Symmetry: C2
Subunit: 513 residues, 2 copies
C-alpha cells in the first residue's frame, strides 16, 4: 500500500540554512564500524532566496558543501557555502545577480550545487556549465574558479564525470565541433604525473559524437563508460539555443525556457571505441524517455549492457521540480505528478557486431536477458529493454554501485533513492540479475542518495555500508541524521544525529582518509 | 535457473496417433473433485504425415478431437479424428490433397479444424482460422457438418478465438475486402439461440468494421479483446501479402506461410470500437513492434481500457520457428534455433478513452496503480508504453486462460498459462496481474498443455477452483500421458488421470459442464 506523507516534513528539504563556523560533533546511536575512516562530501542548494528575491527551481539554490567525518567510531558534521561568483555577488549586491537554471536575474552560472569529484590531488565542486570550483575537502574553503573553456572546446560538461582507477577523468559536453554543426565532445583529463603540473591544463578531446539536429543538442546529464567503450544516450529533450540568445538579448530568459521536446525522434543511442578514439556508426534507436542517471555499463561477449534509470515520455521531467510545487501539501504533490513521465529501470543490450544476414531478426543472442535488438533494412537497430524495476510514480533514482571495483564491469547490485511522486522517501537495493529488492524506510524521514563504501578487505561486491543523509523533522525528533546501513540487506548499523536541519543534497562521494 | 530437456521427450507431442473406437477408463491418482462433472474437450493435430508425404509445420497436422469425461470421481478418455474434407480426401486419395498452413499439396481453402472448439447456440464447432468451421457431436465426438461462414457473412476467415458472452452471443473478427478498393476487418456477431430454435449462424451479422493500415495487406489477427462496452483490436506488423497467394499458388505451389511478411516501419496500431453503439473510435494508438497471438483479458477502469497481452518482441513472424523438423530436434539444437527469435513478454497496455488536446505532450494515464503510459503527440497519435507483468529469457507465459465466465471483460487478478521453454511446453504458471507474483508447476520430462480453469460451484474468490491440463510424459516404465488437475489457488496437484497411450500437442479447448 501507498506510503503517504500528510505531515509535509519534506518541505524542510527546501528550507534555507546557515553555514557552520566549525565542525559539530554528532550524537552516535548504534555502533559505527571502526574501519570506516574518511569523509562523506555532498553538494546541494542551501540558500533558496536572497532577501525577498526567491529562487524558483530545485536547481537554483546556492551551492552548499557538506561533510561528515568518520574517525574511530566518532562523527562530525560541517557545511560551508561555496564562494562562487554567483554566491559572492549575491552577498555583495544583496540580490540575485547571476541567472540560475530556473530563475532569471533582474554571465553563465558557476553555482556548483550538484556534485564534487577528484582531479589529480584536487577536488572540484560542479554544476553542468563550463565553470567548476576547486574546494578544500578538509576545511570546505573555496579555492578557485576554473573555466573549462580555457582548456577544451566544450560549452559545458556534466556533473557526472567518470573516473578510472588510475585517476583519469572522462566527461561529456555539447560543442560546435563539427563544421556548421552541433556535436558532443568527450573530454579526458589525465592523472597527475611526476612533473606534477595541473592535469586540467593537459585536457583533451578524445572523440566526438554527432548530433541528431544540426542546431539543437540534447540535454545530457550522464553517460556510460567501460574499459573499451563510451556509451552516450541522446534523448528527445532538446536545448533550443535560439530561444535563449533571443531572450538574453530581447527579454528575460532562464535556462529552463530553452528546453523543448522532440516528439518524433525517440531515443538514439551511440557508442564509441574508447581506446581507438573512434565513433562507431551503429544507429541504435528506441522509444522516447528522459534519462538522468546511467547505473552501470559493461561488456558481455560482443554486446554492451546498458543499465539506465528512465522516465517514460518525452516531456522534460524538470518541469515538475519547481520549488513551489515541491513545497506543496501531500495531496497536491501527488496530484501534480499524475501526468508526469513514469520512472522505470531498464536494461538495454547493444550488439557490437551487426551482420546483414540477420536483417529483420533479434540480434541479442545472450542467454540471460529478455532485451532485444532488431536490425531493420534501413540499418537502424531497434532496441527493446528488459525492465528491472518499475512502480507507479515510485522511482529508483540517484543510483550508486561499488564503483571502484565494478564500474564498467559485470555486476549484480545497485543502490538508490526511492522517490514517491518526486519526494525522496526510502532507500533501495536492487539485484539486477534476479530483480530482488531490499528497502529501508521510516515514517516522516526523507533520505538522500545512498553512497556505498566497501569494507577495505572485501572480496564480495556488497560487503560494506551505505551512507545516507536523512531529514527527520518533528516534535521530539532530531531534525537530521547520518544513517549507516549494512549493504547486504539495508539493515541499520548506526546513525549520527545532529540538532540542525540539512537541506536536500544531490550527489557526493566518500573520501577514504 | 535453466531447465534442460536432454532426453527429448517433447518429440512425442509431434508424433502421429490412432483414434479410439470408444472411451478408455483412465487410472486415477490423488482425488478428482466430486463437483467436477463434464467434459474437457480439446483440439490439436494427430496425424503428421499421409503415407510417405510429410506435413511440415506445427499447424498442418490433421485435426484430432479429444475428450476427458469426469463423473463421480472417475475419468474416461476418448479421441476421434475430425472428418473434415482435408482428412476425408487424404484418406480416400492416400496423399495430402488440401494445402495446409505450411504444406503445399501436389496435384481450395483448408477446413482442418485443429485449433479450437466453441459453442454456438446448442451446438459445438471445431475451427481453424479459415471460413470453414466444423460442427461436431460433443458426446460421441462424431463429425456432423461442414459450415462455410461465407454463406452467411462477408469475412474471408475468422479467428479460432471468438468471445462468448454469458447469454451465448458470439463475437469474432476476420479480414474482409469491405471499403471501396480496400481491406478492412469485420466484427461478426452470432446471437443466442432464440425461441424459434433457428440456427443462430443464419442470423449472423457484421457489428462494426476496423480500417486497415495498408490498403492491400491486412495484418494476421489471432485474437481480440472484448469488454461490456468496447471491442479492442491489435494490428501488428505481421502482414499477409494477398498479391502473393493468388500469384504464387498458380506457378507451382505456395502455402499460407509463403504469403506472410513483416512490415518494418509501422510498429503496432491499437484500435477500439464502441460495442453497443457499433462504432469505430478514431483514436490512433501506437506502440513499438511485437507479434500478438493471445489477449489475456481486457477491462474498463474509469476512463481507460486495460489491455493485457502475451507479446513477442520484434516484427519477425514467430510461426517461422514452429516447423516440425525444428521442434523435433535434440534439445541443444532446439535452444540454438531460438537464439534470434522474438522474446516473449506479458504486457499491460492502458488506453485512454478521453483525449484532451490541452494535454498534448503529456502522459494521459492518470491511474494510480500502473506504470503504463500514453503520450498524446501533436500529430494526434497516442504513443503507448506498457507495464511489463512477466518476462523471462525465451520463457513465455502463453496460452493464457482466466476465470472467463465471471471475470472475462472485467477487472481481474489472475491468469493461468503454459510456460514455453525455447518454444517447448514444460511448465504451468499462474500470474497475479496486480502484484506480479507467480506460481509454477513442473515435473522433469513432462510436457503440459494450455491449462483450463473450472470454478468450484461454491466459489467465493476468483481463483476458487481447478485448472486442467493434458500432460505428455514419455519414459521408461512411465504412463505416456495423463490429465493433470491442479488447485487453482496455488497450483498444487489435486489428481491425475493416467492413460497408456500417447497424446500429441493440443492447442485450445473448453470444459463443458454437465
Ligand atoms: Fe545527477
Ligand atoms: Fe490461439
Amino acid at each position: 500500500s501507498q506510503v503517504e506523507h500528510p505531515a509535509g516534513g519534506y518541505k524542510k528539504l527546501f528550507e534555507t540554512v546557515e553555514e557552520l563556523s566549525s565542525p559539530l560533533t554528532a550524537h552516535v546511536t548504534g555502533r559505527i564500524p571502526l574501519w570506516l575512516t574518511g569523509s562523506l562530501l555532498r553538494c546541494g542548494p542551501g540558500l533558496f532566496e536572497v532577501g525577498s528575491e526567491p529562487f524558483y527551481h530545485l536547481f537554483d539554490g546556492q551551492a552548499l558543501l557538506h561533510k561528515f567525518d568518520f574517525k574511530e567510531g566518532h562523527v562530525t558534521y560541517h557545511r560551508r557555502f561555496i564562494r562562487t561568483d554567483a554566491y559572492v555577488r549575491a552577498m555583495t549586491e544583496k540580490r540575485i545577480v547571476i541567472t540560475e537554471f530556473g530563475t532569471c536575474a533582474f554571465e553563465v552560472t558557476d553555482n556548483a550545487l550538484v556534485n564534487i569529484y577528484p582531479v589529480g590531488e584536487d577536488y572540484y565542486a560542479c554544476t553542468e556549465t563550463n565553470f567548476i570550483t576547486k574546494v578544500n575537502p578538509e576545511t570546505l574553503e573555496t579555492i578557485k574558479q576554473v573555466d573549462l573553456c580555457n582548456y577544451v572546446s566544450v560549452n559545458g560538461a556534466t556533473a557526472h564525470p567518470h573516473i578510472e582507477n588510475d585517476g583519469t577523468v572522462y566527461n561529456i559536453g555539447n560543442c560546435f565541433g563539427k563544421n556548421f554543426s552541433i556535436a558532443y565532445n568527450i573530454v579526458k583529463i589525465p592523472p597527475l604525473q611526476a612533473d606534477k603540473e595541473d592535469p586540467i591544463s593537459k585536457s583533451e578531446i578524445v572523440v566526438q559524437f554527432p548530433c541528431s539536429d544540426r542546431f539543437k543538442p540534447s540535454y545530457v546529464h550522464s553517460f556510460g563508460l567501460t574499459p573499451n567503450y563510451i556509451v552516450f544516450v541522446e534523448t528527445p529533450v532538446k536545448i533550443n539555443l535560439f530561444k535563449f540568445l533571443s531572450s538574453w538579448s530581447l527579454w528575460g530568459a532562464n535556462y529552463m525556457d530553452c528546453f523543448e521536446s522532440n516528439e518524433t525522434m525517440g531515443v538514439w543511442l551511440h557508442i564509441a571505441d574508447k581506446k581507438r578514439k573512434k565513433y562507431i556508426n551503429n544507429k541504435y534507436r528506441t522509444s522516447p524517455f528522459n534519462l538522468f542517471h546511467h547505473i552501470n555499463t559493461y561488456e558481455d561477449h560482443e554486446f554492451l549492457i546498458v543499465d539506465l534509470c528512465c522516465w517514460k515520455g518525452f516531456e522534460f521531467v524538470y518541469n515538475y521540480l519547481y520549488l513551489a510545487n515541491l513545497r506543496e501539501n501531500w495531496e497536491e504533490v501527488k496530484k501534480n505528478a499524475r501526468k508526469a513521465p513514469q520512472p522505470e529501470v531498464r536494461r538495454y543490450v547493444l550488439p557490437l557486431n551487426i551482420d546483414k544476414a540477420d536483417t529483420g531478426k533479434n540480434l541479442v543472442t545472450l542467454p540471460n536477458t529478455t532485451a532485444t535488438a532488431i536490425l531493420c533494412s534501413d540499418e537502424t537497430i531497434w532496441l527493446e529493454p528488459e525492465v528491472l524495476f518499475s512502480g507507479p510514480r515510485q522511482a529508483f533514482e540517484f543510483p550508486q554501485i561499488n564503483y571502484q571495483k565494478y564500474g564498467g564491469k559485470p555486476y549484480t547490485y545497485a543502490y538508490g533513492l526511492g522517490l514517491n511522486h518526486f519526494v525522496p522517501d526510502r532507500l533501495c537495493k536492487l539485484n539486477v540479475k534476479t530483480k530482488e529488492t531490499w528497502v529501508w524506510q521510516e515514517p516522516d524521514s526523507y533520505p538522500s542518495e545512498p553512497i556505498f563504501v566497501s569494507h577495505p578487505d572485501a572480496l564480495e561486491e556488497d560487503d560494506g555500508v551505505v551512507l545516507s543523509v536523512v531529514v527527520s523533522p518533528g516534535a521530539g525528533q532530531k531534525p537530521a541524521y547520518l544513517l549507516i546501513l549494512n549493504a547486504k540487506d539495508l539493515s541499520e548499523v548506526a546513525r549520527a544525529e545532529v540538532e540542525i536541519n540539512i537541506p536536500v543534497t544531490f550527489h557526493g562521494l566518500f573520501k577514504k582518509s
